[PDB]
Design a protein around this ligand. Structure first.
Ligand code: PRO
Lengths: 290, 4
């Protein structure tokens, strides 16, 4: 499986991968993170199709295989309309489950705030409703880092030497501590990371790296709006997640009846560290709200 | 963002 095509959304060509499930019981749309990465690192969710869950993957504007629109359209709100236009173009009036990871999570929340009427359930993994809070929390993680790496981030970071050999070394430690904690990073993840460093979305919207959000979404925060979401919601976050469970908590407190699951020994990309347990939890939640 |  997985039909791969080029859907023309909002005037531009958007790449998507739809993996159908035999006796389909539901359609799950997924939102990769970054901003500026690609669907690739989310391919582990493809296992849910064996659970009767069709999964829709797709590269957001300017990401991966999709073309980049005008820079003025590098916004969360624009991504929201893109998602809705794509869901409509491919599924029409059918309601679907929406899953978002990291930035994709934040994008999913903003989507739900406006288009929750097109959803059956919402799933956020390592997502966030507030970038500022995410920054504040990540800084703490930096302070808990060993002296060298902590100073490297501050010195080189404040000067902008992200290319420095020491700074990089610090970034690596942090990553293997809050991004992905397991050995042998799967090719799907590497490709998404490579996709980020190549396109322009990550550098313009996000910033230098994972813990450095100096881009255009630096002030984004819809913590006050996500409380309007009245659909079944599943929130997951790794124990050592770069987007700490503290950020997940805020989201959890606003969405009435939402479930918060903190994966132990996992971090950001929990779908790879605990693939079986992750996919099982997501499929269980989905099938519970058919 | 990275890796190596
Ligand atoms: O990935 C990063 O660098 C942060 C967290 C998600 C949005 N920007």
């Amino acid at each position: 499986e997985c039909i791969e095509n080029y859907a023309k959304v909002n005037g531009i060509y958007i790449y998507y991968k739809l993996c159908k499930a035999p006796e389909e019981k539901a359609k799950l749309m997924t939102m990769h993170g970054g901003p500026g990465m690609s669907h690739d690192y989310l391919l582990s969710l493809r296992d849910m199709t064996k659970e009767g869950i069709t999964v829709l993957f797709y590269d957001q504007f300017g990401c991966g295989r999709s073309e980049e629109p005008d820079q003025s359209k590098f916004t969360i709100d624009y991504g929201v309309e893109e998602a809705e236009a794509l869901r409509s173009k491919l599924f029409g009036n059918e309601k679907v489950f929406l899953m978002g990871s990291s930035y994709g999570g934040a994008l999913a929340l903003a989507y739900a705030v406006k288009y929750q009427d097109h959803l059956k359930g919402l799933i956020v993994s390592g997502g966030l409703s507030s970038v500022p809070l995410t920054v504040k929390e990540m800084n703490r993680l930096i302070d808990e880092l060993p002296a060298k790496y902590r100073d490297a981030i501050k010195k080189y970071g404040s000067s902008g030497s992200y290319e420095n050999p020491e700074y990089q070394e610090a970034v690596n430690y942090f990553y293997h501590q809050h991004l992905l904690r397991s050995e042998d990073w799967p090719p799907e993840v590497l490709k998404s990371l490579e996709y980020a460093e190549r396109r322009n979305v990550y550098r313009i919207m996000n910033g230098p790296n994972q813990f450095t959000i100096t881009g255009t979404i630096k002030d984004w925060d819809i913590t006050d709006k996500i409380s309007a979401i009245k659909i079944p919601t599943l929130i997951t976050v790794g124990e050592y997640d770069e987007v700490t469970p503290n950020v997940a908590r805020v989201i959890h407190e606003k969405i009435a009846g939402s479930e918060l699951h903190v994966f132990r020994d996992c971090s950001h990309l929990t779908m790879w560290e605990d693939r079986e347990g992750y996919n099982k939890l997501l499929s269980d939640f989905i099938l519970k709200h058919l | 963002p990275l890796g190596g």
